[PDB]
From a paper:
Muramidases are N-acetylmuramide glycanhydrolases which cleave the β-1,4-glycosidic bond between N-acetylmuramic acid (NAM) and N-acetylglucosamine (NAG) in the carbohydrate backbone of the bacterial cell-wall peptidoglycan. Here, the identification, characterization and X-ray structure of a novel fungal GH24 muramidase from Trichophaea saccata is first described, in which an SH3-like cell-wall-binding domain (CWBD) was identified by structure comparison in addition to its catalytic domain. A ‘domain-walking’ approach, searching for other sequences with a domain of unknown function appended to the CWBD, was then used to identify a group of fungal muramidases that also contain homologous SH3-like cell-wall-binding modules, the catalytic domains of which define a new GH family. The properties of some representative members of this family are described as well as X-ray structures of the independent catalytic and SH3-like domains of the Kionochaeta sp., Thermothielavioides terrestris and Penicillium virgatum enzymes.
Attempts were made to crystallize the full-length enzymes from T. terrestris and P. virgatum. However, in both cases the enzyme was cleaved at the much longer (than in the GH24 family) linker between the domains. The crystals of the T. terrestris enzyme contained only the catalytic GH184 domain, which was closely similar to that from Kionochaeta sp. The P. virgatum crystal, in contrast, only contained the SH3-like CWBD, which was similar in fold to the GH24 CWBD. The full-length protein consists of an N-terminal CWBD followed by a catalytic domain. However, the CWBD was lost during crystallization, so the structure starts from Gly85 and only contains the catalytic domain. The fold is closely similar to that of KsGH184, with the largest differences in the loop region close to the active-site entrance: the r.m.s.d. is 1.8 Å for 204–213 equivalent Cα positions in TtGH184 (excluding residue 208), corresponding to residues 120–129 in Kionochaeta versus 0.75 Å for the full-length catalytic domains (superposed by SSM as incorporated in Coot; Krissinel & Henrick, 2004). There are two zinc ions from the crystallization medium, one coordinated by His132 (corresponding to the cadmium-coordinating His63 in KsGH184), Glu135 and two waters, and the other coordinated by His170 from three symmetry-related molecules and possibly water, or some unidentified compound from crystallization/protein production. Glu125 in TtGH184 corresponds to the catalytic Glu41 in KsGH184 (Glu45 in gp13), and Asp150 in TtGH184 (Asp66 in KsGH184) corresponds to Gln54 in gp13 that potentially stabilizes the ligand. The proposed flexibility of the linker explains the difficulty in obtaining crystals of the full-length protein and its apparent cleavage during crystallization experiments.
Author numbering: 85 to 227
The structure:
């Protein structure tokens, strides 16, 4: 059925993230970072943004108005110009994991801090508060 604490939509999205974690070989630690980030930024839903016209032309579970942030990871269109990718769970995850891997020391870095660095966020506390669930969800997905 569904993953721990996720409805069927969130579950679908998380499975796509977890699947890309396997493909990219980031292990549970990587998966924890991806899911924890997804929970904070969007609660694992695909957001569009009025501020980015092209994003309304892709399937989305809701609309938000944070900067030019789009998708599950709230990747800024400024920096991530391919909106198709930003609005696709698997491809958007690949974009997260790609940046995460370029961070020297990520494999043994605390998850909260790792998400902060990847997202350019100002506080790790938000992501850290979500790791317990991210683990449960990653485990249930096969990582
Ligand atoms: Zn870990
Ligand atoms: Zn700003």
């Amino acid at each position: 059925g569904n993953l721990p604490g996720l409805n069927s939509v969130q579950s679908s999205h998380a499975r796509a993230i977890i699947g890309e974690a396997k493909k990219e070989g980031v292990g549970r630690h990587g998966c924890e970072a991806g899911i924890a980030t997804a929970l904070v930024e969007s609660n694992i839903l695909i957001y569009a943004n009025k501020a980015v016209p092209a994003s309304l032309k892709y399937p989305h579970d809701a609309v938000g108005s944070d900067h030019d942030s789009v998708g599950i990871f709230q990747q800024r269109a400024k920096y991530y110009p391919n909106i198709a990718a930003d609005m696709d769970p698997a491809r958007s995850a690949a974009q997260f994991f790609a940046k995460m891997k370029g961070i020297k020391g990520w494999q043994s870095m605390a998850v909260g801090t790792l998400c902060q660095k990847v997202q350019g966020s100002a506080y790790p506390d938000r992501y850290a508060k979500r790791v317990s669930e991210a683990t449960k969800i990653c485990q249930a997905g096969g990582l």
